[PDB]
Every structure is written in C-alpha cells, then in structure tokens.
C-alpha cells in the first residue's frame, strides 16, 4: 500500500508473496492473489488448479513440465505438489531420482528432493526401495540438511524394525526424537497450532513405532493396536494427519511379517479406504481397498460399493449392494445391524439414484422395520423420504392430501423417541405438517375429507408420542409453538396448549419468560390463553416457588420501562429470583449427541442493575444491566418496537449457523454468524441481548478521521447533498471519497499488533461479514448505516443489530436503499489487498450454495412470519421474492443464475459508484 | 430404439403381422400405427403393455436377454429424448393443428410430454433413464400383464 | 442353449466367452454378460469399469492388483488395460520390466509383455528408452514371437 502499486513493482513483490500464503494455512486469498494482477504467465493459471479440487489435472501438467530438465525448482515444485496430495508411491517411483538405479552426488538443492523421497519411502512400506535408498544416502559425505536426517533416521528405524531388532529401532527413533526436540521444534505461545501440526503428526508417527516395536508377542500386540486405535480418536477428523498416522501403521505392519501384523494390516487398509472415501479423495481409497481383496475381507464388497457411489456411477453400486443384500438371505451374518444397515443403504441410495418408484422403496422400508425396529436411523430415512417426496410431487400440480404427511409424521414421531440426534432439522418440518392440513381441514372442509381424517389422528400421534418422548425437544419450535396458537382448529389448540404445559412442568425457568410474555397482548386472545396455561401450572404438582407471580413482576416492570420516554430507579428487589437471565448463554440447547442435561447450568438473575443508559438515535430505546449468578455484567436492551419480526430473523440465524457448522465447504473455512437471544414481551416492545466488547464503525471512523485532523461536518454534510441535482451526485460522491482515505485496514493493526491475531482476525472479519452480507440481502435487510455494523474487539466478528426493516422494506421509502448490502470503500481494502476477489467472494459462494441446497428448510423456518403477521398480501409478495432470492433468481429479467453469477451480480452492484452516489446520507456511503 | 419411441408416442396394436423385419440386414419396422397417443388402452381388454416384448423376442436379443445391448441402447435413446424435449415436442405440436380442437388431444400431449421427460404414469414424478428403462422392461415382460391382453395381440407367441 | 444351463457348467464356459466379445468390437453384450450369472468374484465387478467411462478407476485398481507377483496373467491384464487406453508413457515406465535396468530371460508369457513394451516405446519417442530396450531385445536367442518382431523392427527403424 505504501508503494504506488500502479507501477511495475508487482513482479518482484509477488514471487515471495505466494510463499507467504501457501504454508500459512490460508488458501482463498492465495487463489485470490493468483487471479488478480498476475495474469501474464499461463503457468500461474496452471498452479491455481492444485488448490481447487482439480489438483490431478495440475499434477500431470507438472509431470510433463517436470520432464524439461531446464530448472531444478520446476522439479521440486512437482515433488511438493505430489507430497501435498499424498502421492507417495508416485514420489518414490519418480525418474528424477532413479537415473538408472542410484542417485546423484552432494546436494545443493537436491536435498530438498531427498527430503521428499525419504519421507514417501517411509510412508510406503517396502523394505527394498527403503533399503537401497539409505544405501544411497550413506554414500554421502557431510549431510548438512536439518530435514533429511529426521526421515533418514525414521527410515533406518523401519529397516531395523523389519529385521526384528527391537533395541536398534528404539535407538534410531530416539535419534529422531533428539532431532525434533532440538532442531525442528520452535517456541509455543507465538505460533498457532496449525503450523505446529505438521510436526505433531510426525511425532505421533514416531511414538507409535516405538510403541509397536516394544512388543514380544501377539498378546500385548493386540492391546497395542487397541491403544493406538484409542489414539486415533484424539486425532480429530482432518485427512492429512489421519492418512499419515495410518500410513505409518501400514508401513510398520508390512515390514514386520507377523500374521497378526497382517491381520492388523488388512484393518489399516480398510480404514484408509473408508477414511479416504469420506474425504472426497477416492483416488487412493480404491488402491488401498484392493489390498483387502488379497486378504479377502468379507467387508470390502460394501466398501467398493461406497467407492462406486462416490465416484459417480450409481447403477453398478446399486447392483453390488443388492448383490450383497441377497447374499444376506444366507446364514447368520448378524441380524441386528449388518443386514438392516445394508438394506438401509440400499434404500437410501435407491432414493438418491432416482431408479425406482415409491412403493418399491416402501415395500422394503417395512422390511427394514421388520428386521430391526429398535434403531431410528431407518425411521429418519423414511421420514426424510416422505418429507422429500411431498415436495417432489408438490413441484408439479399436486394439491393437499393428508396421507403423505400422515405417514411422514407417523415415522418422525416414532423416530424421535430413540436417539433424538436429528431433532433440530426435522421437527420444524414435523409441526409445520401438523398445522397445514389442520388449517386445510378448516378452510374448505366440505372431497378432501381424507385430510380431515388425516388431521383426526396425527393429533392422536402427537398425543401418543408426547407421553413417551423426551420433553425438551419441543423447545426448538417454541416460537413456532408461540405462534399458530390462534389456529381456529379447537382440537390442535388444546394440544398446542398441552405442549406448553408439558414444557412448563419439566424445565420451567427457561420458558417462563416466553409464557409470561404470552399472557401479554393488545388483542385479548393470547392473554386469554395465558390464564389457561397458568391456571393449570400451579394446579400441577411441583410448584416450588411463587415464581409465576414474580415472573409477571419482572415482566410488567420490563414492559413498563419502555413507555417512560425521557427527553428513575424503579423496583429493585425482584432480583434475585429463580428466573434465569435472558442472555443467549442461557437459552440455547446443547447439541444432542448419544445421559445429558439439555442446558448449560443455571446462571440466574441476582441483582438487577441500577444505572441504565439510553442511546442517541431518533427513536430512542434504552439499555439496562443484569448481574448474573457469576456476577458478569450482562447487557439488556429494551426497545419500543415489535421484535417478533426480530425473533424470526434470529431463528433464521440459528437455523443458518448450525447448517454452516456442518458443511465441509464451510467447516474447512470455519464460517459462522453472530447471534443473540431476542425475546418479545408485547407488541411494539421487546428485549434483546447485548454482545460485549463491540464497537460501531461510526465510533471507529470518528476516532480515525479526527486523528488525521480531517475537517468535516454532519449537518453541513448532507444539506449540500440535498441541494445537488441528479447529475451532481456522482461528482459529490467522488469528491467525498477523495476527501476521506480508506483507513480501516489499520484499525485492525491498532487492535491486534500481534500479527498472527491480526491475520486470523482479518480472515474472521472477511468471512463473518461475507456470510451475513447476503444473509441480510436475501432477507432484504437494508438500513445498514455505520452505527449498526458492530465489530467485536476480541476476535473481529461482524454483527448487525438494528434489523427493524426486513423483506426489502428499505426500498419502500424516499431516496430508497438500492444497495444489496453495505459494501463501502473502507470495508473493501479491509478485506485485504485483493479486495472483494478473495475470501469474501469464495465464502459468499459457499454461503449461497448452502442456502440453495437447503431452500426447503430455510423457507420452512421463515414460514412463521406469515403467522406472526397474519394476513397481508405484501407478506406474500415478500415471501415470493425471498424464495426467488434463495434459489438465485436475479430481480430484473427473472430467471435462475448461478452461485458465482449471483455473487458477481450482488458484488458488482454493491460496489458500483453510480449506485453508491444515490442513497441517503443517513446510510452515508462515502465513509 | 423404436421399442419406446412407439411407447412414448403410445403406439400399441403391435400384433405379429406388424413387426416387419428385413432379410437384408435385420432392421425392425412398425407399419400399422393407426392408433397413437395411447389410444390402444381405450378399447375393451385394453393393450396395457408398453411395447411388444415377448418370449420369442427376448432370447432373440441374445443369451443375456434384455440385460444387454437392448437395455443400454434403450437408455441412450431415452437420454437423447430427454435432452431434446423441446424440439421433439415442437415437432409433435402439429398434431394439435392437424386435428384441431380436441381436449383429449390436450391430455394426450400432456401425457406425451411426461413420457418424454420421464415421469412414471402412476405416482407421477420424474424417474431416471435407467429407472424408466427398468420400469418399462419389467412391466413389458411381466407375465401377469402378458396374460391379460387380447389374442389379436397374441402374447404367448 | 443346448446345455441345460441351470447347472454349474457356466464356470468353464465363461472365461473364454468374455474373450469372444472383448475383441469382437461389441461391448454392450460383454458388459451385459459380466453383470449376469457371473457375480461371484469382485474382480469381475472391477473389470466392468474399464469399458464404462470410469476406466481410470479400474486402472489404479489393476496397478495394485498388479503388485502381487502371484500370477503372470494378472500382470498382462494390467498391461493390456493400459494399452487399450493409450497410457504409453505409463507402459514404458512400468516396474514389471525394469527389474533394476534390464529385463528377464527367454519368454514363455513375457513376450506378450514385450509386445506391449516395444509398442509403447515406439509411440513414446525417446531414443534412450528405445535404444536400451532393443539392446535388451537383442540379447535373446531365438525370438519365436510373430508379434514382437514387427514392433522390434519399427523400433530399430526409429
Ligand atoms: N446485540 C447488540 N450488541 C451490541 N450493541 C447492540 C446490540 N443491539 C443494539 N446495540 C446497540 O444499539 C445501537 C442502535 O440500536 P437499535 O436497535 O438500532 O435502536 P435504534 O433506535 O433503532 N437505532 P437506529 O434504528 O439506527 O435509529 C447500535 O448502534 C449498538 O450500539
Ligand atoms: Mg439502528
Ligand atoms: Mg430503528
Ligand atoms: Mg396392421
Ligand atoms: Mg390398422
């Protein structure tokens, strides 16, 4: 930046700039650096392939660039590109080492070759190509290289471990520990764990060789293998260390020719195969699985079916999996899972293959249920099958019947009682089927009497399921249970009151906030049900306290501290209470895995804060304080606005980020959005949570413009804009952006002078802003002025806090907000050098692809806007525009555009200066 | 190829006097074709086969029967018809102006469009090319179907 | 057909039946013969891949079946599956020929290997790996093979 970069100093600056990204752990800026201002050589366009899933297209390009013999570094580029992609057998078989049999003399750059060629020879256990290799190493004179000698000592340890000599290989592994403990190891508390991990995988592969060598018999060797398989659980789930450690156990078990070592070796090949086919790298899963056929395992017939399924060919995988299914009409072949899971996989990717009609799949779904009925993954599968087939008929001209939701609910509710680990993403799909046919049985009930018979007993399914399912699992649809109470059904209204009774008996203190806001409205129907839900609560047995009356004492106080507009220090002894705090670190649910308690431990209200605060906006809402059970100052914000809209934004957020934490296109990049528990109290009022350590970027830019002594105005600023015509907007915008230089790239310096925290903070900034940058636009957020882009000092996340207008309401006002989202020249170079063509664009594409893949669930979550605000037609147009924005239809000339296309459209209309000149100086764009 | 080019057009009436074979090279032609648009189901003891696949013809395809060149060329035919839905429907639009104003011609054209795109005629939703091939073959050679139809289209031959 | 085929005579009938399709030019019956009444061995399910667009998935399966050193014909199956898919540079770089630098002695089935290894060396123009190759050919005594000598003469012409 301090260089004038427009000149030609970007030749010598870049050939080491890519070095400072290609081992930093970050890729999406490296791929962004390569495709911007570096487009001269075609080899630069070739090296982008080896990070973007077409790496083997770049491998064999490098192999024939590697047979030019002109430069030594274009050979080690090929070797490092092989080693980064685990082509170990291809490294040791390279002709760059084998002149005829041996290798060349003392090594200026050849040692960097040998460092690879040793290491792959350690990972391919073959005593001859490992033994002549160190025969060629020990002809050298003075091995200066710090890196060669580690893999050398591991190699001679493996050669001694093949010669059945325990103390000798202990000696050489202790030499390897000495070399790592002096030379390779560096300081902690400065570097990450990401760069230390490359050495920790080698240490974990050094310990298990000493742990498997120290064994004189199979009696302890089996125990050693179980201890190492226990050590394969702390390892995590990344492919590189998993494959490395399993490759070293592979290299152990085929140098030691014990028969128990070979029985271990078949297990290691099968685990390498099923490891690699789950990591989308079936190039080596096949050539590891084929070792299990010379051992002839009876489990490789299914593993090759999964490799065929991941390859792409569907019908041959179906043929082999049904071949081993009718092989399970033979003898025992344990009846519990090894038959039922094979038939379940057959049905699941018979569904996915689209190679059958429905009843052919159902006739063996019931066969799965016959052969095993105490295991709910088949019930999950058939619930997903019906709750997919309902849309795949509904895409055509299919209308409301009841049987395809009857069977769906009848298998979902039977599913939930067993393992309850798929409740977050399926039970909202359940109880929207519970209250669609129920309303259709009220709309035009006099044939479509079938759904009237279907709604007669799905209510019976809910009643019969509630008595022997867990209680907490209804909390996930709690606001959807808080809405749709006025359903005009009179048979599911009693059940949706019963579902709040049952949720109030066990675990009251969380939902008592919602149940006290429930007996509060202007329309006197929610309150009328609020007595009924609270008449019968104290009628139930466990009434430990007067916490209902004290709960209303909190509630009416908190809804009367929003009327008192001052332009006071009321009741205080309501705290302490067994009522628990409204912070989002009270009200979530812990992730259901397979006895746990469904909450974080209780951090209740203790001392209500006294000194409040009101903010400097036009419409002025007010901030309170809470002292919790730990004594932390928990902030609380009370607004005189309907935050019932703001809760559904937040439930969209909490069904969005838990999908973001499941996609490997996002968990590799660690996406996420901020979140805070917002609750309604009554209409045109509400409470919401205060994320700590935050700052508005008005406050960031106010203290940096004045630090440069740049003189500007706030009242004289926008009247000049008001007095400009339609033509002067562009020149006014260009003069204002030449006034203020972009300065947000050094506020990240001033927060994190530790540069590793700065780098991780800028990546976290770009990614976390990138997701919500069109999660808001798809919801039509707008109103994104500089007092509402809140950044946290701790790590650099981005949160959006105002969000009063959604569903593109910001276009329905004079000088309308016609940006998709606030992308603004302070924020662009804050994303980095390359700007928007970097982690921002890639994480945007991942976000949009994940929202297109989950259209039905996200639209199903946002359906509750239509019953929060009931009967508008503009809400219908808003939901249709929302559906088209999710699927990716451009709002002008409407037809479906790609994820990269929609990303480029929204970015090149967000940073467009002709747009950024137009909008109102409340949303002041030139900042 | 014509085994479901006729079925997609709803050919029927495929009795043994209308499966003409040439002595020169062994092609197959269909010559009667008076009824199209699945009209053969609108008569008593209706023709409920997709096409005449009949146990003289099965082992005539070879040892492996229908699981061979027949199935693969069927899949290639159905995939090429799905890839060219718009042009083939555009060619067959002229039925609607040869015979002008029927409503059964509209139902016939909609069933024709669903047969081209690959929708199974019971529980209607989109099925794959290998799926539609296996469906039409395992309902053509099904003996419970082949017992039913009239001895004009005599199936046991 | 004249055999009652329901019995177990379909073991000795098939291992030459696939031979009578895999060079006849027809594939869709060969792929139809393999997936019907022949579903015992998994290697039979592997060899269906090399005719149905996933041939390189079967190549590297054959390469690690080809490093078992148990049978000579499971090596020439790998070599013919390479040659049918034009992997000439991968044929001449095979370790089944290069013991260290040279090759093995007089050839019962190894000549079927050399017939491939000459021919790919003709198709990869590289004078050193073509010159030491016919240096190894001319150490032999009596090359009986009708197929070797064509590619040999093309090699010495090159
Ligand atoms: N969750 C939160 N975390 C931190 N600060 C918050 C949060 N919610 C609101 N704020 C603060 O509240 C300010 C504005 O609150 P807001 O909800 O926008 O009320 P408002 O009157 O609508 N403001 P505005 O619409 O811009 O006139 C922001 O600038 C933040 O400082
Ligand atoms: Mg605001
Ligand atoms: Mg506001
Ligand atoms: Mg006729
Ligand atoms: Mg006729």
Kindly state the DSSP code that residue B41 receives in the 8-state scheme. Answer: G
**Hunting for tokens 């790298």 — which residue is that?**
A281
Listed in sequence order, the residues at least 6 apart from B9 whose beta carbon sits closer than 8 Å to its beta carbon are: B36, B37, B92, B112
A355, A390, A395, best to mutate vs chain B, most B CBs in 10 Å: A355
Among A60, A125, A155, CA closest to A288: A125
Spatial neighbors of A705 by CB under 8 A, at least 6 apart, are A712, A740, A743
Structural tokens at position B16: 């043994």
Q: Is the Cβ–Cβ distance between A212 and A228 less than 8 Å?
A: yes
Indicate the residue of A314, A315, A358 with minimum beta-carbon distance to B123: A358
Q: Which residues line ligand 1 (CB under 6 A)?
A: A 615, 617-619, 621, 637, 639, 676, 688-691, 694, 696, 787-788, 790, 801-802, 804
Which chains reach chain C with 3 or more Cβ–Cβ distances below 8 angstroms?
A, B
According to the entry, how was the structure determined? cryo-EM
Question: Tokens at residue A144, please?
Answer: 């200066």
Q: Give the bridge partners for A290, in sequence order.
A: none
Nearest chain B alpha carbon to C31: B68
The C-alpha atoms of residue A643 and residue A784 are separated, in whole angstroms, by: 18
Contact across the interface for A358 and B124, Cβ inside 8 Å: no
Tokens at residue A707, please? 């630090």
Q: Which two tokens stand for residue A459?
A: 């209510």
Q: Among C42, C43, C44, which would you mutate to test the A interface (most chain A Cβ atoms within 10 Å of its Cβ)?
A: C42
Among A313, A353, A357, A361, pick the best mutation site for testing chain B contact (most B Cβ within 10 A).
A357
Whether C137 and C119 have beta carbons less than 8 Å apart is answered as no
Which residues on B lie below 8 Å from C29 (Cβ)? 62, 64, 68-69
SS3 A687: strand
End-to-end Cα spacing for chain A: 19
CA–CA–CA angle A839, A845, A847 (5° rounding): 100
- Residue indicated by tokens 């209250």: A435
* CA–CA distance, A765 with A415 (Å, rounded to integer): 40
A176 CA → ligand 4 middle, Å: 87
Distance CA(A280)–CA(A266), nearest Å, equals 22
Encoded tokens for A472: 């907490």
- Residue A460 to residues A409, A463, A633, B35, Cα–Cα distance (Å): 11, 5, 47, 52
d(CA A582, CA A608): 12
Neighbours of A33 (CB within 10 A): 21
Q: Coil, helix or strand for A689?
A: strand
Question: What's the CA gap between A924 and C61, in Å, rounded?
Answer: 62
DSSP per-residue letters across A553-582: HHHHHHHHTTT---------TT-S-SSB--
Which pair of structure tokens corresponds to residue A496? 């949706």
Nearest CA in chain C to B65: C32
Residues of C in contact with A315 (CB under 8 A): none
* Residues written for chain A: 927
* Ligand with minimal distance to B18 CA: 4
Tell me the two tokens of residue A327.
């092989």
Q: Which two tokens stand for residue C46?
A: 């592997």
Contact: A293, C42; criterion CB under 8 Å: yes
Query: What are the angstrom distances between the C-alpha of A403 and each of A45, A432, A852?
Result: 55, 15, 28
CB spacing of B125 vs A396 below 8 angstroms: yes
Map residue C62 onto helix, strand or coil: helix
Pairing mode, if any, of strands A686-689 and A633-639?
antiparallel
What angle is formed at CA A718 by the lines to CA A717 and CA A719, rounded to 5 degrees?
Answer: 100
From atom 31 of ligand 1, which residue's Cα is the shortest distance away? Answer: A696
CB A847 within 8 A of CB A771: yes
The whole-angstrom separation of Cα A843 and Cα A767 is 6
- Considering only CA atoms, which of A893, A891, A698, A878 is closest in space to residue A781? A878
Rounded-to-integer distance, Cα A452 and Cα A442, Å: 9
Ligand nearest to the CA of B35: 5
**Beta strand ranges found along chain B (DSSP E):** 19-21, 28-30
CA A10 – CA A36 distance, rounded (Å): 11
Residue A546 burial (CB count, 10 A): 11
Please give the helix or strand (H or E) that residue A55 lies within, else none.
helix A55-65
Residue with tokens 């024939």: A64
* Residue A740 half-sphere exposure toward CB, CA atoms < 13 A: 23
User: What distance lies between CA A870 and its chain's CA centroid?
Assistant: 33
Question: Is the separation of the CB atoms in A551 and A516 below 8 Å?
Answer: yes
Helices (H), A718-809: 718-723, 728-739, 747-751, 755-778
Query: E-strand spans in A67-202?
Result: none
What is the signed CA dihedral for A463, A464, A466, A468, rounded to 10 degrees? 160
Report the residue of chain A nearest C102, measured CA to CA.
A100
Angstroms from C1 CA to nearest CA on chain A = 25
Q: Check CB contact under 8 Å for B69 and C29.
A: yes
Q: Is C31 close to B72, i.e. CB distance below 8 A?
A: yes
Q: Near ion ligand 5, which residues have CB within 5 Å?
A: B 32, 34
In whole angstroms, give the CA distance from residue B9 to residue B2.
10
Q: Residue A322, class by beta-carbon neighbours within 10 Å (0-12 exposed, 13-18 middle, 19+ buried)?
A: middle
- Angle, in degrees to the nearest 10, between helices B85-92 and B69-83: 80
Backbone angles phi, psi at A688, to 5 degrees: -150, 165
Rounded-to-integer distance, Cα A156 and Cα A170, Å: 11
C33 vs B63: CB contact, 8 Å cut-off?
Answer: yes
Edge-to-edge order in the sheet of strand A798-800: A694-696, A789-792, A798-800
Query: Closest chain B residue to C33 measured between Cα atoms?
Result: B64
- In B, which residues are within 8 Å of A355 by CB distance? 127-128, 130-131, 134
Distance CA A669, CA A843 (A): 8
Cβ–Cβ gap A357/B123 under 8 Å: yes
Q: Which residues of B touch A315 (CB under 8 A)?
A: 130
Give the single-character DSSP code of B14.
-
Give the chain B residue nearest C30 (alpha carbons): B68
Residue whose CA is at the smallest distance from ligand 1 atom 14? A802
C-alpha atoms less than 13 angstroms from C-alpha of A609 in its C-beta half-sphere: 18
* Residue A873 to residue A878: CA distance in whole angstroms: 9
Label residues A485-505 b or e (16+ Cβ within 10 Å = b): bebebeebbebbbbbbbebbe
CB atoms within 10 A of CB B122: 9
Residue from C43, C51, C55, C61 to probe the interface with A (highest A Cβ count within 10 Å): C61
Paired residues of A607 in beta bridges:
A627
Strand partners, B28: B21
Residues 6+ apart with CB under 8 A from A690: A623, A634, A635, A636, A637, A676
Task: Give the three-state DSSP class for C72.
Answer: coil
The DSSP call for residue A614 is E
Cis peptide before A751 (omega within 30 of 0): no
Report the distance separating Cα A34 and Cα A48, nearest Å: 7
Q: How far apart are the first and last CA of chain B?
A: 22
Residues of C in contact with B58 (CB under 8 A): none
Contact status, residue A815 vs residue A718, Cβ threshold 8 Å: no
Angle formed by the axes of helices A508-518 and A547-560, nearest 10°: 50
CA A738/CA A926 separation, integer angstroms: 9
Contacts of B94 (CB under 8 A, 6+ apart): none
Buried b (16+ CB within 10 A) or exposed e, A109-134: ebbbbbbbbbbbbbbbbbeebbbebb
- For A449, the token pair is 């009497």
Q: Is A494 left (phi over 0), alpha (psi -120 to 50) or beta?
A: alpha
Contacts 24+ apart (CB under 8 A), A458-462: A458/A402, A458/A405, A458/A406, A458/A409, A458/A410, A458/A433, A458/A434, A459/A434, A459/A491, A459/A492, A459/A495, A461/A409, A461/A410, A461/A413, A462/A409, A462/A413, A462/A434, A462/A492, A462/A495, A462/A499
Bridge partners for A687 per DSSP: A638, A679
Rounded to whole angstroms, the Cα distance separating A862 from A654 reads: 12
- HEC sequence for A796-849: CCEEECCCCCCCCHHHCCCCCCCCCCCCCHHHHHHCCCCCCCCHHHHHHHHHHH
The DSSP 8-state label assigned to residue A602 in this structure reads: P
Distance CA A372, CA A89 (A): 44
d(CA B51, CA B66): 13
* A354: chain B residues, CB-CB within 8 Å: 126-128, 131
A-chain CB neighbours of B135 within 8 Å are 357
């Amino acid at each position: 930046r301090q260089n004038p970069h427009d000149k030609n100093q970007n030749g010598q600056l870049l050939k080491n700039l890519q070095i400072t990204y290609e081992e930093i752990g970050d890729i999406d800026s490296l791929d962004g650096v390569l495709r911007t201002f570096a487009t001269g050589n075609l080899v630069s366009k070739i090296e982008e392939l080896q990070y973007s899933e077409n790496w083997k297209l770049a491998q064999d390009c490098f192999n024939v660039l590697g047979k030019f013999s002109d430069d030594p570094k274009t050979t080690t580029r090929m070797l490092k590109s092989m080693y980064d992609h685990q082509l170990y057998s291809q490294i040791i078989s390279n002709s760059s080492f084998h002149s005829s049999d041996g290798k060349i003399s003392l090594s200026p750059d050849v040692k960097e070759w040998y460092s690879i060629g040793l290491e792959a020879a350690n990972l391919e256990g073959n005593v001859q190509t490992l033994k002549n290799w160190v025969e060629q190493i020990e002809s050298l004179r003075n091995i200066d290289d710090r890196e060669v000698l580690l893999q050398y000592n591991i190699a001679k340890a493996l050669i001694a471990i093949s010669n059945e000599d325990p103390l000798r290989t202990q000696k050489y592994i202790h030499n390897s520990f000495r070399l790592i403990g002096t030379n390779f190891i560096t300081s902690s508390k400065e570097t990450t764990l990401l760069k230390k991990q490359n050495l920790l995988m080698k240490l974990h592969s050094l310990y298990d060789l000493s742990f498997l060598s120290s064994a004189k018999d199979k009696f302890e060797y089996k125990s050693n293998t179980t201890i190492l398989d226990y050590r394969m659980e702390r390892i995590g789930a990344d492919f590189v260390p998993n494959h490395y450690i399993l490759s070293m156990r592979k290299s152990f078990d085929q140098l030691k020719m014990n028969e128990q070592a070979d029985a271990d070796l078949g297990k290691t090949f099968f685990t390498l195969a099923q490891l690699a086919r789950n990591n989308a790298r079936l190039d080596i899963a096949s050539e590891s699985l084929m070792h299990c056929l010379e051992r002839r395992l009876p489990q490789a017939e299914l593993e090759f079916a999964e490799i065929l399924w991941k390859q792409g060919e569907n019908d041959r995988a179906l043929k082999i999996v049904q071949e081993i299914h009718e092989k399970y009409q033979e003898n025992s072949s344990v009846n519990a899972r090894d038959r039922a899971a094979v038939l379940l996989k057959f049905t699941e990717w018979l569904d996915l293959s689209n190679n059958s009609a429905s009843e052919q799949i159902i006739k063996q779904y019931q066969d799965i249920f016959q052969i095993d009925s105490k295991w709910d993954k088949p019930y999950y599968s058939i619930g997903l099958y019906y709750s997919r087939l309902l849309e795949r008929k509904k895409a055509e001209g299919y209308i409301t019947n009841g049987r395809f939701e009857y069977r769906a609910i009848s298998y979902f509710l039977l599913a939930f009682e067993k393992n309850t680990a798929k409740v977050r993403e399926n039970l909202p799909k359940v109880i929207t089927f519970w209250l669609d046919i129920a309303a259709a049985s009220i709309s035009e009930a006099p044939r479509k009497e079938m759904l009237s018979k279907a709604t007669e007993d799905i209510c019976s399914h809910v009643e019969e399921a509630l008595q022997h399912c867990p209680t907490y699992i209804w909390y996930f649809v709690l606001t959807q249970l808080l809405s749709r109470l006025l359903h005009s059904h009179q048979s599911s209204a009693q059940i949706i009151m019963h579902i709040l009774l049952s949720l109030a008996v066990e675990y009251p203190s969380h939902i008592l906030w919602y149940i006290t806001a429930l007996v509060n409205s202007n329309s006197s129907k929610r309150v009328l049900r609020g007595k009924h839900i609270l008449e019968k609560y104290r009628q139930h047995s466990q009434n430990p306290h007067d916490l209902v009356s004290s709960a209303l004492d909190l509630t009416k106080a908190l809804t009367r501290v929003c009327l008192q507009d001052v332009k006071f220090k009321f009741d205080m002894n309501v705290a302490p209470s067994a009522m628990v705090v409204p912070v989002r670190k009270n009200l979530d649910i812990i992730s259901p895995l397979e006895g746990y308690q469904p909450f974080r431990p209780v951090v209740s209200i203790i001392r209500f804060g006294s000194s409040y605060k009101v903010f400097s906006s036009l419409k002025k809402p007010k901030q309170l304080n809470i002292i919790g059970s730990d004594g932390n100052i928990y902030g609380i914000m009370c607004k005189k606005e309907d935050v019932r809209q703001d809760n559904q934004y937040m439930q969209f957020a909490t069904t969005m980020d838990f999908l973001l934490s499941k996609d490997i296109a996002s968990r590799k990049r660690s996406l996420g959005i901020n979140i805070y528990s917002v609750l309604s109290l009554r209409e045109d009022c509400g409470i919401l949570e205060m994320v700590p350590n935050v700052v508005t970027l008005r406050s960031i830019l106010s203290t940096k413009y004045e630090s440069l002594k740049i003189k500007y105005s706030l009242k004289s600023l926008h009247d000049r804009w008001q007095h400009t015509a339609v033509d002067g907007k562009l020149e006014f915008y260009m003069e204002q952006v030449d006034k203020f230089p972009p300065i947000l790239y050094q506020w990240f310096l001033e927060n994190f002078p530790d540069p590793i925290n700065w780098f991780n903070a800028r990546n976290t900034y770009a990614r976390s802003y990138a997701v919500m940058a069109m999660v808001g636009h798809i919801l039509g957020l707008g109103d994104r002025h500089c007092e509402n882009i809140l950044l946290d000092i701790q790590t650099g996340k981005v949160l959006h806090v105002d969000l009063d207008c959604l569903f593109e309401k910001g276009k329905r006002l004079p000088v309308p907000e016609i940006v998709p989202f606030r992308l603004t020249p302070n924020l662009l170079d804050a994303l980095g050098i390359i700007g928007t063509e970097g982690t921002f664009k890639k994480s945007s594409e991942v976000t949009l692809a994940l929202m297109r893949k989950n259209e039905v669930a996200l639209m199903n979550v946002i359906e509750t806007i239509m019953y929060d605000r009931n009967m508008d037609h503009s809400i219908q147009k808003a939901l249709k525009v929302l559906r088209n924005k999710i699927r990716g239809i451009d709002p002008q000339d409407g037809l479906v555009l790609s994820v990269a296309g929609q990303t480029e459209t929204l970015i090149q209309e967000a940073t467009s200066e002709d747009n950024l000149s137009k909008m109102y100086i409340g949303w002041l764009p030139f900042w």
